[PDB]
C-alpha cells in the first residue's frame, strides 16, 4: 500500500458545495431518496503494487463500494445485480473514469480535478452535468 | 436545410495539421496503410428540420458516409456487416459523439471544437488521443 504519488490519491470528503447532482441522479434513472441529496461522501484512492484502489462510502446510506483499477485497463464491478464496466485513465493530469452500465444503456463520464487540498469531481451522463467538491481529510 | 446556428455546422476540409493520428488508428486495430496518413477528408454538418446530417467523405478512398442524428438520441450505422452505435451531444458550444464498436469492444470519443474559422477534431480511445484540424471550405 502507497498513499502518495498522484495528486488525486488520498482521503477526500464531500463539502456543502454541490451543483446539479439530483438532476444527474435522475438522469441515471435512480430514485432520488436513496441516491440524491448531499449526504457525506468519502473517496479514498491509494496504490497497491501495480494497481489502484478506489473506495467510495456514504455512511448515512450505509453504502460502500471498493473498486480495483489499473490505469487504461477495463474492469468490472456490480451495484446490486447490475454489471458496471469501467476504465480509469489520466488525461491532462486529471483522473477520469469511463463508466458504462450496458444493461441500462447509460454512459457516465467522471473527472477528478485537484486544486491543492480541494478536489472537484464532475459527473456527466447524456447532456446532464453535475459537480461536487471534496476536501482532504 | 439550415447551415448556420451552431459553430460546428458547416463544410469542413482537412488540413496538413494532424497529431498522433496513426497511434489512434493502431489502438483501434486498423491497418495504417489504408486508414492512416492524412488523406483529404471532408466533414459536412447541417440541420434538416428535426435532425442533423453529418456527411464524412474521403475521396481518395471512395468513402462517403451519410450519418443522421438527433442530439441526445442513439443511432446506428454499419461497419462490415456489424452495428456501430453512436450518440451525439452538445458540450456547451462543441459537439461530441460517443461511439460503441461492440464487435471489437471499443468505445471511441469524437469531439468537434471550433476556434476559427477552424475546427479541431479530437479522437480518443482509452488513453490514446489524436487530433486533426479542419478549415471552412
Ligand atoms: C475510424 C475513424 C477514421 C475516420 C477518418 C476520417 C476522419 O478524420 O473522420
Ligand atoms: Cl453502455
Ligand atoms: Cl458498453
Ligand atoms: Mg463523489
Ligand atoms: Mg475527420
Ligand atoms: Zn499494500
Ligand atoms: Zn437525503
Ligand atoms: Zn488490489
Ligand atoms: Zn457502453
Ligand atoms: Zn496536442
Ligand atoms: Zn465515453
Swiss-Prot record, chains A, B:
Region SAHS-c2, residue ranges: 46-74
A Gene Ontology molecular function term of the record: lipid binding
Region SAHS-c3, annotated ranges: 87-136
Cellular localization per UniProt: Secreted
Region span, SAHS-c1: 2-31
Residues with attached carbohydrate: 80
GO cellular component, one term: extracellular region
Oxidoreductase is among the record's keywords: no
The entry's keywords: Glycoprotein, Secreted, Signal, Stress response
Keyword check for Transit peptide: no
Note: Trehalose, a disaccharide essential for several organisms to survive drying, is detected at low levels or not at all in some tardigrade species, indicating that tardigrades possess potentially novel mechanisms for surviving desiccation involving tardigrade-specific intrinsically disordered proteins (TDPs).
Family: Belongs to the Secretory-abundant heat soluble protein (SAHS) family.
Protein role: Secreted heat soluble protein acting as a molecular shield in water-deficient condition. Tardigrade-specific intrinsically disordered proteins (TDPs) are essential for desiccation tolerance by forming non-crystalline amorphous solids upon desiccation, and this vitrified state mirrors their protective capabilities.
Domain-related comment: SAHS-c1, SAHS-c2 and SAHS-c3 are 3 highly conserved regions within the SAHS protein family.
Protein name listed in UniProt: Secretory-abundant heat soluble protein 1
Species of provenance: Ramazzottius varieornatus (Water bear)
Gene: SAHS1
Residues of the full protein shown: 31 to 166 of 169
Amino acid at each position: 500500500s502507497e498513499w502518495t504519488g498522484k495528486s488525486w490519491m488520498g482521503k477526500w470528503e464531500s463539502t456543502d458545495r454541490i451543483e446539479n447532482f439530483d438532476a444527474f441522479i435522475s438522469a441515471l434513472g435512480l430514485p432520488l431518496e436513496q441516491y440524491g441529496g448531499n449526504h457525506k461522501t468519502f473517496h479514498k484512492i491509494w496504490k497497491e503494487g501495480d494497481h489502484y484502489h478506489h473506495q467510495i462510502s456514504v455512511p448515512d446510506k450505509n453504502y460502500k463500494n471498493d473498486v480495483n483499477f489499473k490505469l487504461n485497463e477495463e474492469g468490472t464491478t456490480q451495484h446490486n445485480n447490475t454489471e458496471i464496466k469501467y476504465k480509469y485513465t489520466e488525461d491532462g493530469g486529471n483522473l477520469k473514469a469511463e463508466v458504462h452500465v450496458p444493461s441500462r444503456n447509460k454512459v457516465i463520464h467522471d473527472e477528478y480535478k485537484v486544486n491543492g487540498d480541494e478536489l472537484e469531481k464532475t459527473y456527466k451522463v447524456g447532456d446532464v452535468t453535475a459537480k461536487r467538491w471534496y476536501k482532504k481529510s
